[PDB]
């Protein structure tokens, strides 16, 4: 399933350029309300996917011993991932945190080899190193890069974790269902302690934007986990890294983001890497 990687990439790119549009059209909105309402809205989409694909529910497969990996990955990538990424946005810029979130596959390509004993010794390493070089050639810095690598470690380790559970008796739709359930619970606990207001979600326009963003993000995650299931964690993240090309394209086309010559070079480098990987 090689095209599923690129499909996950394009759909996360659409989701991200919808999120940018949302946060640009609304000022008072905060990422904690957005993530919570996104997850609460997407839980329905996941129930729909599960009910349509196979039988109603299978809760005997949600064993407590094995799926600790998926819950720890969800609470390690969802809540604190977004928190530290917004911290990086407030610290060192709105577009460098996303660049590091795209250079994330380094920690994944390390862990999948060392921890999961995967065999990617020389094939994928070159494409991923070239993508990394392009992202670093695109660009207080010692703390900004520290928080950025803290985000990247988590977002690259959720993949290694999610490929640990799905080795035996956990399909793509359930291993993601528990992920979204636990991320929603975590964001609920976080909001409840801070008493964050929910008045903004009642808007119909915001609800429409949130449902299209949740649909895009969820198709992205579903294709990405179908890839990981049958293409592992070593390349299934490298193939998905292509979403930066898309994100930049849709930002310079639709949202009217200014185009510079350096971003064209970085996009050419990363597309060269993605083409090298196959």
């Amino acid at each position, epitope marked *: 399933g090689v095209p599923f990687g690129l499909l996950s990439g394009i759909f996360w790119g659409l989701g991200l350029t919808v999120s940018a549009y949302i946060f640009s059209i609304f000022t008072d909105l905060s990422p904690f309300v957005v993530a919570a309402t996104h997850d609460f809205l997407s839980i329905f989409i996941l129930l729909a996917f599960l009910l349509v694909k196979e039988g109603k529910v299978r809760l005997s497969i949600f064993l407590n011993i094995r799926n600790v990996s998926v819950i720890i990955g969800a609470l390690l990538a969802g809540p604190i991932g977004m928190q530290a990424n917004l911290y990086a946005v407030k610290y060192i810029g709105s577009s460098l945190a996303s660049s590091v979130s795209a250079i994330y596959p380094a920690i994944s390509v390390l862990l999948a080899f060392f921890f999961l004993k995967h065999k990617i*010794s*020389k094939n994928t390493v070159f494409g991923i190193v070239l993508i990394i070089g392009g992202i670093i050639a695109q660009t207080s810095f010692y703390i900004g890069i520290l928080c950025a690598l803290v985000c990247a470690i988590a977002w690259g380790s959720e993949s290694v974790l999610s490929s640990f559970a799905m080795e035996s008796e956990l399909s793509e739709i359930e291993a993601l269902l528990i992920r979204q359930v636990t991320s929603f619970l975590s964001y609920l606990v976080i909001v409840l302690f801070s008493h964050q207001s929910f008045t903004a979600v009642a808007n119909g326009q915001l609800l429409g934007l949130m449902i299209v963003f949740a649909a895009f993000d969820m198709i992205s995650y579903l294709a990405y986990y179908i890839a990981i299931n049958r293409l592992q964690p070593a390349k299934a993240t490298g193939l998905n890294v292509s979403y930066v090309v898309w994100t930049v394209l849709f930002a310079v086309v639709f949202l009217g983001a200014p185009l510079d010559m350096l971003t064209i070079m970085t996009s050419l480098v990363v597309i060269a890497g993605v083409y090298i990987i196959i």
Partner: nanobody, 112 residues
């Protein structure tokens, strides 16, 4: 993709030495790591560079050449079917019977 044939197996008295041979046939141009198992990792050579990784239990007693496995100082614990193996792509992770996709039939070696 590649057919592996082993030769040289048999019965050997403990305290001597023995040589085992592996011949590969087919698309043999892009195979990086060659191996020798008994499925534990006992030997693995790199083709281009020419390094050989061994098992700590036999490191210094068995030797690899380019595939020939020369086993010295035999012990009755070495009675096993030895298998050949190859790897499409490899840099630093030998001795694992999940990296190597091309597998042979193996020949029996019995130490007395």
């Amino acid at each position: 993709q590649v057919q592996l044939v082993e030769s040289g197996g048999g019965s050997v008295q403990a305290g001597g030495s023995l040589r085992l041979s592996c011949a590969a046939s087919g698309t043999i141009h892009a195979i990086g790591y060659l191996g020798w198992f008994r499925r534990e990792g006992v030997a693995a050579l790199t083709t281009y560079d020419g390094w050989t990784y061994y098992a700590d239990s036999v490191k210094g007693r068995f030797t690899v050449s380019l595939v020939y496995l020369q086993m010295n100082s035999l012990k009755p614990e070495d009675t096993a079917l030895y298998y050949c193996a190859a790897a499409d792509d490899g840099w630093m992770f030998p001795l694992y019977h999940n990296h190597y996709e091309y597998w042979g039939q193996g020949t029996q070696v019995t130490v007395s």
